[PDB]
Design a protein around this nucleic acid. Structure first.
Ligand SMILES: [K+]
Ligand SMILES: [K+]
Ligand SMILES: [K+]
Ligand SMILES: [K+]
Ligand SMILES: [K+]
Ligand SMILES: [K+]
Ligand SMILES: [K+]
Ligand SMILES: [Mg+2]
Ligand SMILES: [Mg+2]
Ligand SMILES: [Mg+2]
Ligand SMILES: [Mg+2]
Ligand SMILES: [Mg+2]
Ligand SMILES: [Mg+2]
Ligand SMILES: [Mg+2]
Ligand SMILES: [Mg+2]
Ligand SMILES: [Mg+2]
Ligand SMILES: [Mg+2]
Ligand SMILES: [Mg+2]
Ligand SMILES: [Mg+2]
Ligand SMILES: [Mg+2]
Ligand SMILES: [Mg+2]
Ligand SMILES: [Mg+2]
Ligand SMILES: [Mg+2]
Ligand SMILES: [Mg+2]
Ligand SMILES: [Mg+2]
Ligand SMILES: [Mg+2]
Ligand SMILES: [Mg+2]
Ligand SMILES: [Mg+2]
Ligand SMILES: [Mg+2]
Ligand SMILES: [Mg+2]
Ligand SMILES: [Mg+2]
Ligand SMILES: [Mg+2]
Ligand SMILES: [Mg+2]
Ligand SMILES: [Mg+2]
Ligand SMILES: [Mg+2]
Ligand SMILES: [Mg+2]
Ligand SMILES: [Mg+2]
Ligand SMILES: [Mg+2]
Ligand SMILES: [Mg+2]
Ligand SMILES: [Mg+2]
Ligand SMILES: [Mg+2]
Ligand SMILES: [Mg+2]
Ligand SMILES: [Mg+2]
Ligand SMILES: [Mg+2]
Ligand SMILES: [Mg+2]
Ligand SMILES: [Mg+2]
Ligand SMILES: [Zn+2]
Lengths: 99, 154, 110, 150, 43, 305, 118
RNA sequence: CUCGAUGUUGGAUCAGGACAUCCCGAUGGUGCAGCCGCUAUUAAAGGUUCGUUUGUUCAACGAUUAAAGUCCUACGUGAUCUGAGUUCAGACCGGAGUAAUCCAGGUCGGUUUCUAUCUACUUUCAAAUUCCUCCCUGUACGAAAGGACAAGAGAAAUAAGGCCUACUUCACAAAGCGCCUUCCCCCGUAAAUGAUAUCAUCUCAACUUAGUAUUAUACCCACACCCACCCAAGAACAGGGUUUGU
RNA sequence: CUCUUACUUUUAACCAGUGAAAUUGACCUGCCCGUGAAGAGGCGGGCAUAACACAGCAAGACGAGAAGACCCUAUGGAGCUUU
RNA sequence: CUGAACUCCUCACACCCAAUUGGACCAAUCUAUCACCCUAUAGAAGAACUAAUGUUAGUAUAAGUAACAUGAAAACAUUCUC
RNA sequence: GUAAAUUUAACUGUUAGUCCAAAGAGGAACAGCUCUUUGGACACUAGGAAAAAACCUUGUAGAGAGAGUAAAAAAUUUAACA
């Protein structure tokens, strides 16, 4: 019975581990976990947490690039919010439309 | 607590203890060598030493005769005490008996001792002998002694 | 008061096999020089003591034959004399218990 | 359960598929009774299926042995030395076809828990993370609160 | 110290439950959906 | 691998010789330390308020009565200083404590019964081994060179001292003797319950509080008697007459120190500091020092006039 | 510099540290101020200890924590240091620490009466 | 919850805890002169008696005490005790019933098991409380009668920890009825200076004093001679001594 | 009894021989507060915590023992009395 | 932002309610006929045990625990103590 | 908008009930109290409210080292005056 129910916990614990590892990597670049994940989505980067945790460990230069991209998109959000609509959309804020 | 309690608690009480010790002492006087439990031999050894002192007072000392009459349950041994054992130790002030531990008793594994009156006619016990003066250690110490004596006379 | 639960073999092995429960090795065993049999340093050799007792018992049986009854203890000293020996000047006036064997080497005449 | 059984890492036999794919199944040994009812489905597999299956797999030597037996069995042997015995007792011809095809596709490695659903010998291209990966250097490598040129 | 008599969440004397900020926001979020449902059911 | 003792392998001739040899060396070593002030003593500083000097180790000889000039009877315990020497000095820095310490040892014991590490320590000091070593917290100005002998006249009549020793060991004892519990009635029905503890706790807590008084080993622990007055000092035999009783059995070793009681603070202005040096002393002290209120043995009979 | 930690509010007087010797009457409660003067590292040590996971690894982690009340650090520990972490709280400047440029830059907000005994 | 049993009063033994404080400490008020009281704030370190009748808890009474506190702990505690009571089987009285029997009644009598498996515990080693006597003093106070406080001095009781010189039980020793030692604080308030509010104001204003302990110090601290023997050490083990191993 | 103390014997503890009984779901069998079929070694939050004997103790394991004898129920019994 | 066994995603799908009720399979045994290193189709039945203070037997736990026993010396003759 | 419904045939079990919201009754506008009514939950899953039958979220079943969500954290600080 324990073996059966553990399949739920295995999935839960794995994702918790990825978030802890992603959180650690993000803090090394001065970014909080919610800021990285949220802004990557707004760039249409759909990398999941498993891959993001793997990149932090084995591809640290790519991860810094992703952290930089999220940081850039985050600052574009602030500029837009502060403006009254006069400003055009940020370069990285433009969304690719599909049909 | 039993601080300074010099006597053991054996037998069925104080009277029985004396009777137990008296029987051992009577056997010792007759045979001059007996084996018994170590604790009981150790207890009796003091009485066996003092009995000789009473024997040295002589058979004309009425107190000595009463002491010997009580402690020797076989009356033929009273002449032996005054005329055989006590004269043998005329030139000693003590150390009339020797007590040595022997292997544990077979049945109950009781610690055992052999006790005898010194100077008996029986085959001698295999007494523990100290190492010879000719051993390596004893010779090195003899040299050290010789040297010190030579330096003092100078 | 009764045992509320059975004690497991794991618990029992810890109690039984604890070093306190084990038999301690003895470091005071040495060879006897006279006979070669083992002895403890503070205890008389069993083999040698038995030999002495056997001779003592034989002499005591001879003393009994001379006494020939109870309450017949002598008033003089005693000397054991073996075959081929005669009383010395110092053995005069002493009851002579004769043994029908050669004097044991360990038994020294005095 | 996982704790009650052995496990291994995902792997291949001689880096199979890297330069070329080599079928790991090397030998098949059938034991089909002539008269046993349990072997009815195995006899029908030997009449129409085994010959066509051998044409497709010329690297597998199939040994059909007809002898009295209460339980017909197929024994699969692989290049890595693994031996697997699977009963075909009372199985239909279609069931046996499926089983035999499965044996052909397997590598021969132990069918036990696989710790990871992937394997790689080169997990890092940019350099595996270490505590100094994202730390900045300091002039003359001075430590915190360290007096220089004293 | 600080016991609740009997069982915590029943009876006369109960453990007080307080409304957190996010509990309020959750309720308001569903109130907005239902308000819009009212509108689309009006035509 | 078999254990050995000092005279195990010695012959009949060598046992007396070895005993005499080691005995004489012990006596010679003790005699060589009788002149501390001629052997490069450490600086002798004057007494200052707040200074703590070393104490002594003494053997408890027994008890004795003495009467004061007002007629009152006071029993005293005789404490003899037997071969007391300073052994080690530890500076305040290395002590690991707020104060420096001076190690004192008392009473000579056989070298054949001490561990090798202890024997080599005493070999370097040039003294025979001591039975008991005690540590005395001292101020820097009170340091004394290791190897200095200490004497009963270190203390003076009128002073107050604390005495620490191991109490008499009574083994495993019941609550009545150990803790003074009342026990239970002798008769009126009591069933196998006369000297028992009774209830040991309440039902609610379902356990026994730490520190609960129960049967167990009684005595044989260190205790200290505070504020004992020094009535008399015998300088010839080096005996200290201390008021009342001290812990431990007769012939045990006791630690004697100056009393720490608030009332007796800063009373060492007139006491020997850092200690009493009989060799340095210009005028030899009389055989007995008496407190002013003590009736001396040869004094006339008391009269209330 | 654990001796120089600062609590917000009145935690020095209000925050109590509770322990029990285990003996009857052994319950002890001390304020943060009392504990700090008794043990200048206890407060930081207790704050860290309570935040670590409540498992058998915690006491091992505490072995890797090195608390010092002042600015003295043993040479061995000083030699193995790698990086200093930024202080979490920005220390506010006292009025006497402001430069005359900063004081001059802040405007005067009101005109006091000339006849007022300030 | 428990009837394939959670033993039911009071007492003995040992007590743990609360403070809504009986006594002892520190304060405000008083229809507080003083001596005694009353009331409130603060304080749980320490303490809180012996007897006659009753099974009693209580209550009454005698003699005391600085005081004879209120409560909780399965109306604390029966694998520690007791069994007078209550609460089986015998019996009597009064009453009820035709009787068998019965009674919130009374009365005499009536078997209290357990070898401890687990948890817990078995030297929280060492700062102590109080009464009385003298003195202050026949002083402050008061018309008188009456009559203190602080300081100081001594002498005791209890508690804790030890001891055997004498006494006593005793007699190589163990004991009390004997002797010896015993050391810090505690916060309720009372007052200055002084703003908000240019007086004033002891201040959840900045601040000053009564007003405080990093509770002080003490104790403990060296350890392959060790087979064996002795011991003031001890259930065993351990510990001390053997330079006292014929 | 105030108020207990000392000694002797038994028991006791250690060595040797012989060798039971109730009991036992499994146990890798701590403390505090809280919780809960309403009194927790096992749950929540804390704290504590190398391992293993021997001797004591009786606060807990709603300890062991006896399918509560009190009480109620059963169209279950039995003894006794009777208009 | 975190957060389910809700929902989506790749593949699969009869595969999480007591009493009770419906259904699909099935261990071993015997018999008929097969089979012939252990089976098949049927027919039968003393046809399946982690629990009844279950019955019998074995062995644990408590436990090497509770408890039990031989007056002394000696030449084993004898004597001594009670 | 949905897919059930009645009838015919053949049966067993259930007929000792708990909390929550609501309308009332009894009690003391006591009870984790007692008695009816309407509904929910429990006696089935999982997440949440600290532990948690009865509150909230959520149900249909397998594998996954994907993903989006549901319920889901407690706030508060005070008396001058002519
Ligand atoms: K409630
Ligand atoms: K019951
Ligand atoms: K237990
Ligand atoms: K004011
Ligand atoms: K006595
Ligand atoms: K118990
Ligand atoms: K919830
Ligand atoms: Mg998830
Ligand atoms: Mg006996
Ligand atoms: Mg509750
Ligand atoms: Mg003792
Ligand atoms: Mg008594
Ligand atoms: Mg009885
Ligand atoms: Mg009795
Ligand atoms: Mg039961
Ligand atoms: Mg109490
Ligand atoms: Mg109060
Ligand atoms: Mg009770
Ligand atoms: Mg009983
Ligand atoms: Mg009880
Ligand atoms: Mg009665
Ligand atoms: Mg009648
Ligand atoms: Mg009665
Ligand atoms: Mg009677
Ligand atoms: Mg008992
Ligand atoms: Mg006065
Ligand atoms: Mg003023
Ligand atoms: Mg002003
Ligand atoms: Mg016992
Ligand atoms: Mg035995
Ligand atoms: Mg049972
Ligand atoms: Mg509880
Ligand atoms: Mg349990
Ligand atoms: Mg029971
Ligand atoms: Mg029943
Ligand atoms: Mg009937
Ligand atoms: Mg679903
Ligand atoms: Mg499905
Ligand atoms: Mg089959
Ligand atoms: Mg059957
Ligand atoms: Mg079975
Ligand atoms: Mg059974
Ligand atoms: Mg036992
Ligand atoms: Mg026994
Ligand atoms: Mg007997
Ligand atoms: Mg119905
Ligand atoms: Zn020999």
């Amino acid at each position: 019975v324990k073996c059966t129910k553990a399949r739920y916990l295995k999935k839960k614990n794995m994702r918790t581990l990825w978030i802890n590892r992603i959180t650690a990597a993000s803090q090394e670049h001065g970014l909080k976990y919610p800021a990285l994940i949220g802004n990557l989505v707004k760039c249409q980067v759909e990398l999941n947490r498993k891959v993001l945790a793997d990149l932090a460990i084995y591809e640290p230069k790519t991860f810094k690039s992703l952290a930089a991209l999220a940081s850039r998109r985050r600052h574009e959000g602030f500029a837009a919010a502060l403006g009254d609509g006069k400003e055009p959309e940020g370069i990285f804020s433009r969304v690719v439309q599909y049909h | 607590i039993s601080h300074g309690r010099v006597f053991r608690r054996m037998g069925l009480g104080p009277e029985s203890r004396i009777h137990l010790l008296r029987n051992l002492l009577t056997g010792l006087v007759r045979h001059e060598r007996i084996e018994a439990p170590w604790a009981r031999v150790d207890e009796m050894r003091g009485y066996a030493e003092k009995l000789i002192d009473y024997g040295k007072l002589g058979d004309t000392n009425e107190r000595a005769m009463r002491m010997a009459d009580f402690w020797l349950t076989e009356k033929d041994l009273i002449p032996k005490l005054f005329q055989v054992l006590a004269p043998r130790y005329k030139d000693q002030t003590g150390g009339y008996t020797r007590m040595l531990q022997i292997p544990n008793r077979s049945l109950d594994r009781a610690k055992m001792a052999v006790i005898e009156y010194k100077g008996n006619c029986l085959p001698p016990l295999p007494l523990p002998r100290r190492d010879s003066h000719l051993t390596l250690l004893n010779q090195l110490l003899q040299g050290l002694r010789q040297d010190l004596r030579q330096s003092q006379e100078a | 008061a009764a045992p509320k639960n059975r004690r497991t073999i794991e618990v029992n092995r810890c109690r039984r096999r604890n070093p306190q429960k084990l038999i301690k090795v003895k470091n005071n065993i040495d060879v006897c020089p006279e006979c070669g049999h083992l002895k403890q340093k503070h205890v008389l050799c069993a083999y040698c003591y038995e030999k002495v007792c056997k001779e003592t018992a034989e002499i005591r049986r001879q003393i009994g034959k001379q006494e020939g009854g109870p309450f017949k203890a002598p008033t003089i000293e005693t000397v054991v004399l073996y075959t081929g020996e005669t009383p010395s000047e110092q053995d005069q006036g002493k009851r002579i218990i004769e043994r029908d064997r050669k004097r044991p080497s360990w038994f020294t005449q005095n | 359960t996982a704790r009650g059984t052995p496990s291994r890492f995902l792997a291949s036999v001689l880096h199979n598929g890297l330069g070329r794919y080599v079928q790991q199944l090397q030998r098949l040994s059938f034991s089909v009774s002539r008269d046993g009812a349990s072997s009815r489905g195995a006899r029908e597999f030997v009449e129409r299926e085994v010959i066509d299956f051998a044409r497709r797999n010329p690297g597998v030597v199939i040994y059909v042995n007809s002898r009295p037996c209460c339980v017909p069995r197929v024994v699969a042997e692989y290049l890595n030395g693994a031996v697997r015995e699977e009963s075909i007792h009372c199985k239909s011809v279609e069931e046996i076809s499926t089983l035999v095809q499965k044996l052909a596709d397997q590598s021969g490695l132990d069918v036990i828990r696989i710790r990871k659903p992937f394997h790689t010998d080169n997990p890092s291209i940019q350099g595996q993370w270490h505590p100094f990966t994202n730390k900045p250097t300091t002039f003359r490598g001075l430590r915190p609160r360290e007096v220089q040129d004293p | 110290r600080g016991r609740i008599p009997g069982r915590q969440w029943i009876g006369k004397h109960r453990r007080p439950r307080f409304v957190s900020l996010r509990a309020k926001q959750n309720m308001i979020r569903r109130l907005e959906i239902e308000a819009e449902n009212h509108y689309w059911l009006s035509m | 691998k078999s254990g050995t003792w000092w005279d195990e392998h010695l012959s009949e001739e060598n046992v007396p010789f070895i005993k005499q040899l080691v005995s004489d060396e012990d006596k010679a070593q003790l005699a060589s330390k009788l002149c501390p002030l001629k052997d490069e003593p450490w600086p002798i500083h004057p007494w200052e308020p707040g200074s703590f000097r070393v104490g002594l180790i003494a053997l408890k000889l027994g008890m004795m009565p003495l009467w004061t000039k007002d007629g009152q009877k006071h029993v005293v315990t005789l404490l003899q200083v037997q071969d007391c020497h300073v052994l080690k000095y530890t500076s305040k820095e290395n002590c690991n404590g707020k104060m420096a310490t001076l190690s004192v040892g008392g009473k000579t014991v056989s070298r054949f019964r001490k561990a090798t590490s202890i024997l080599e320590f005493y070999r370097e000091l040039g003294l025979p081994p001591k039975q008991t070593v005690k540590i005395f917290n001292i101020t820097d100005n009170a340091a004394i060179k290791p190897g200095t002998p200490l004497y009963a006249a270190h203390f003076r009549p009128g002073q107050y001292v604390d005495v620490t020793a191991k109490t008499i060991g009574k083994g495993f004892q019941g609550v009545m003797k150990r803790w003074g519990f009342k026990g239970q009635p002798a008769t009126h029905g009591q069933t196998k319950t006369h000297r028992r503890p009774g209830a040991v706790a309440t039902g609610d807590i379902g356990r026994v509080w730490p520190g609960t008084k129960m049967p167990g080993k009684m005595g044989n622990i260190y205790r200290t008697e505070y504020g004992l007055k020094v009535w008399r000092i015998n300088t010839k035999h080096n005996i200290i007459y201390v008021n009342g009783s001290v812990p431990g059995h007769k012939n045990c070793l006791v630690k004697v120190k100056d009393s720490k009681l608030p009332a007796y603070k800063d009373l060492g202005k007139n006491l020997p500091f850092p200690t009493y040096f009989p060799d340095g002393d210009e005028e030899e002290l009389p055989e007995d020092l008496y407190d002013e209120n003590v009736c001396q043995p040869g004094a006339p009979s008391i009269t209330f006039a | 510099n654990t001796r120089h930690i600062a609590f917000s509010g009145n935690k020095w007087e209000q925050k109590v540290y509770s322990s029990h010797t285990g003996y009857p009457g052994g319950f002890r409660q001390v304020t943060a101020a009392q504990l700090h003067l008794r043990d200048p590292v206890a407060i930081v040590k207790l704050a860290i200890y309570g935040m670590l996971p409540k498992n058998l690894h915690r006491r091992t982690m505490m072995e890797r924590l090195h608390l010092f009340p002042d600015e003295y650090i043993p040479e061995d520990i000083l030699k193995n240091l790698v990086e200093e972490l930024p202080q979490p709280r920005k220390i506010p400047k006292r009025l006497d620490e402001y430069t005359q440029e900063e004081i001059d830059a802040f405007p005067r907000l009101w005109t006091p009466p000339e006849d007022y005994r300030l």
